[PDB]
Design a protein around this ligand. Structure first.
Ligand SMILES: Cc1cc(Nc2cc(N3CCN(C)CC3)nc(Sc3ccc(NC(=O)C4CC4)cc3)n2)[nH]n1
Lengths: 343, 20
């Protein structure tokens, strides 16, 4: 309807995206590299741990700016066969530029580790606020959902698939706006790809079924997210991943009684097993989503410009978790030099 | 309630990605 339509506002999108692509490609082809050193950073505390090492709150000594430094033990990345994913992660993250994406501010490596210095978000991740509060109101969830729709419009126009959408991966900034943090499974691919990766609750059925897949898996994951934000639980849950997968591939979804009829219609079109019928994957692409009823109150340009009043602003002062802290040990011999040469 | 079933399940904390 309004979705299968041009041209004046659709042309501005086109122009924005073409300029963004030109920007992106320069950085894609000539990646930033070795742009800091460990000793430039005062390590304040551990924020969290991933499979490859700690994420630390750090302070850049020469600007006093605060960042989150993701450390990756090279040997653990090799054992986990995540070399190419790690290289994707960094190559893509240094190249993108969007208001709702965590910036890769510096990267470097030493004998033992890879280091990714990221934009610090004082609010922490959405997961925590969502579990604490229980669930978000539809307008609240719509606000965040709108930011993901624009971010996906941006990433997809660059031939990127994100592959890890979930509340754990979305940071809330000082203005109450979102930043997508984790590029671990991001990939640049024209056409189809096959890696079984992602987080069980958020996997599209074509991933579970080893079908080979594209960017439409991101759109399904948006469906899970919106449902999770508004329900306070995932549309498919169980105690074990294999029980989750059977629920995902069955083709059935029950909605809570408080979901508006517009919300349910949106979600049915996002959580659609049939790629032929899944919103975001049709002739109108993202516009099927953008001009849906549930989004009728959304001013997209205002969202992009951060003009909309955030429903929640993080308290700034204690509140941090405590971890055992230990000094970074750097081996005297270089590990996995060849495998990571391009980092 | 479905919420009570969720809160009682073993998947209410941070969920790890798989890559096999
Ligand atoms: C990357 C990043 C992280 C942050 N900020 C924070 C902030 C935070 N806080 C703890 C709770 N108080 C209430 C707010 C501050 N807790 C975490 S715990 C945490 C740690 C790491 C990640 N994610 C990653 O490192 C992704 C990139 C691989 C998410 C949450 N991260 N800003 N930028």
């Amino acid at each position: 309807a309004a979705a299968a339509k041009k041209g004046s506002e659709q042309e501005s999108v086109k122009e924005f995206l073409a300029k963004a692509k030109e920007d992106f490609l320069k950085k894609w082809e000539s990646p930033a590299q070795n742009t800091a050193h460990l000793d430039q950073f005062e390590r304040i505390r551990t924020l969290g741990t991933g499979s490859f090492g700690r994420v630390m709150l750090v302070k850049h000594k020469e600007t006093g700016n605060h960042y989150a430094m993701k450390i990756l033990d090279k040997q653990k990345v090799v054992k986990l066969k995540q070399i190419e994913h790690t290289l994707n992660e960094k190559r893509i993250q240094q190249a993108v530029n969007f208001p709702f994406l965590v910036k890769l501010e510096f990267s470097f490596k030493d004998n033992s580790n890879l280091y990714m210095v990221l934009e610090y978000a004082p609010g922490g991740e959405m997961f925590s606020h969502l579990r604490r509060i229980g669930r978000f109101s539809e307008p609240h969830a719509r606000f965040y959902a709108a930011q993901i729709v624009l971010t996906f419009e941006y990433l997809h126009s660059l031939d990127l698939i994100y592959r890890d959408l979930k509340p754990e991966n979305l940071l809330i900034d000082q203005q109450g706006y979102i930043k997508v943090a984790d590029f671990g499974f991001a990939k640049r691919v024209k056409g189809r790809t096959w890696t079984l990766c992602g987080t069980p609750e958020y996997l599209a059925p074509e991933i579970i079924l080893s079908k080979g897949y594209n960017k439409a898996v991101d759109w399904w994951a948006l469906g899970v997210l919106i449902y999770e934000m508004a329900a306070g639980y995932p549309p498919f849950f169980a105690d074990q991943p294999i029980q989750i997968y059977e629920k995902i591939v069955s083709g059935k979804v029950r909605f809570p009684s408080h979901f508006s009829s517009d919300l349910k219609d949106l979600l049915r079109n996002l959580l659609q097993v049939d790629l032929t019928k899944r919103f975001g994957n049709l002739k109108n692409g993202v516009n099927d989503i953008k001009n849906h009823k549930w989004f009728a109150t959304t001013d997209w340009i205002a969202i992009y410009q951060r003009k909309v009043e955030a429903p929640f602003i993080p308290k700034f002062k204690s509140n941090f978790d405590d971890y055992e802290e230990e000094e970074i040990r750097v081996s005297i011999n270089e590990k996995c030099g060849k495998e990571f040469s391009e980092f | 309630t479905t919420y009570a079933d969720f809160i009682a399940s073993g998947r209410t904390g941070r969920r790890n990605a798989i890559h096999d």
